[PDB]
Structure 1
């Protein structure tokens, strides 16, 4: 009866393949849930509503490739950390001007509301304009129709999109910024539960299951 909030669409961590939801988080959690004997149903939602949802305790926990920041640590709890990510710039295939993250002068950057991509862009870039959208597909399309210069979002995400959907239309520029970890988020006070999911996480690590989930989605082992 645990309800776990996930992202509407965050390839390749959770997305709709036909009927059900599919992805790295979905599997990892199905594995943890299996390990612990938890019963649950998932509940996808636009990322923006997830932290609020945990806070209002409308959902019991959440996976949506959610970055651990100590800023967020004030509001919710996090497990002991499951995937090392970062941020990457995406522009159009034959874009010329941008080599960088220097949109830092007067470029229009599209991002997804509620995410650390907005945090980072605010704190680090002098954008002429910054467009926020409920989901990243809206932001890709802003780039594709020439209404933004770049998109900035999670490395794995703009990497999975380029090689699959976005192929020949878009490219990554530079290397991964903002080395960060995803973790499973909980309401505050859910420590019978969290100091425990951590336990399962270390088990999936030790028994090699993590390696095969990862391998499934990224094409190699972690190490």
Structure 2
């Protein structure tokens, strides 16, 4: 059986990788990448937006064929799913109010209220420093609602991947927030397939490799980051 539709699991509160434009259309780097992969495979994408923490189980239970969701390749997740070669290297950032001087790194979150996306690597990084240090960790499926808790004063900081932190700041120029503690790598993004689906995996890796040789990938990158 030759699958003509690729069901792509993603979460769409993660600009610039996946979000909704003013007409409600899914847009972003990951969206364009998924379409460019499908073109190489000779198939059509169907997006399946869902809450992030449910994506791995959706792949395991056959609700989707692939994940393209800014998903960091980790050893824990490699137990659950198989990943492509990395397609992006991200870092992390903390977003705080402009008048904040106490928070410059993860270590400084002691005693503070911190918002994170449920199921994310940021959640894990925060949980690691939060051991003992009295951090109050709050969780959101919709990251535009962790961010709104920061703008409203309901949390002191939020933590996410660095390009996404910048995109939220740029969307909120009057909202008096800033990035601190930025790092630039350490979160390699991978496309996930169901564990054991070696035929699909190989096709996706070959598509990535070709996209990086023929200009296709670089044009996507420049569109979103140039």
Give the structure-2-normalised TM-score: 0.92
- Please provide the CA RMSD for this pair: 1.5
Instruction: Please say if residues 108 and 127 of structure 1, whose CA atoms lie closer than 8 Å, have aligned partners that are also in contact.
Output: no
Match of 1:217 among 212, 221, 224: 224
Residue aligned with 1:97, SS: coil
Instruction: Please say if residues 108 and 129 of structure 1, whose CA atoms lie closer than 8 Å, have aligned partners that are also in contact.
Output: yes
Between 142-151 and 198-207, the greater mean CA deviation after superposition: 142-151
Q: CA deviation at 1:177?
A: 6.7
Note if 1:194 corresponds to 2:201. yes
Q: CA deviation at 1:99?
A: 2.0
Distance in 2 (alpha carbons) for counterparts of 1:19 and 1:174: 32
Q: CA deviation at 1:56?
A: 1.0
Instruction: Please say if residues 93 and 182 of structure 2, whose CA atoms lie closer than 8 Å, have aligned partners that are also in contact.
Output: yes
Q: Structure 2 unaligned runs (5+)?
A: none
Match of 1:13 among 3, 14, 17: 17
Aligned length: 219
Give the corresponding residue for 1:58. 63
Note if 1:89 corresponds to 2:94. yes
Instruction: Please say if residues 87 and 177 of structure 1, whose CA atoms lie closer than 8 Å, have aligned partners that are also in contact.
Output: yes
Distance in 2 (alpha carbons) for counterparts of 1:167 and 1:10: 20
Where does 1:88-127 land on structure 2 (aligned, <5 Å)? 88-125=93-130, 126-127=133-134
Note if 1:133 corresponds to 2:137. no
Distance in 2 (alpha carbons) for counterparts of 1:19 and 1:139: 20
Give the corresponding residue for 2:36. 31
Match of 2:163 among 156, 180, 191: 156
Residue aligned with 1:68, SS: coil
Between 75-84 and 102-111, the greater mean CA deviation after superposition: 102-111
Q: Deviations over 1:105-135 (max 9, x none)?
A: 2111111111111111111343421000111
Instruction: Please say if residues 103 and 109 of structure 2, whose CA atoms lie closer than 8 Å, have aligned partners that are also in contact.
Output: no
Distance in 2 (alpha carbons) for counterparts of 1:89 and 1:198: 32
Distance in 2 (alpha carbons) for counterparts of 1:83 and 1:127: 34
Q: Structure 1 unaligned runs (5+)?
A: none
Distance in 2 (alpha carbons) for counterparts of 1:101 and 1:177: 15
Q: CA deviation at 1:100?
A: 2.1
Q: Deviations over 1:145-178 (max 9, x none)?
A: 1111110100010011112335552100122176
Q: CA deviation at 1:210?
A: 0.8
Give the structure-1-normalised TM-score: 0.93
Choose between structure 1 and 2: higher helix proportion: 2
Note if 1:72 corresponds to 2:108. no
Distance in 1 (alpha carbons) for counterparts of 2:122 and 2:114: 10
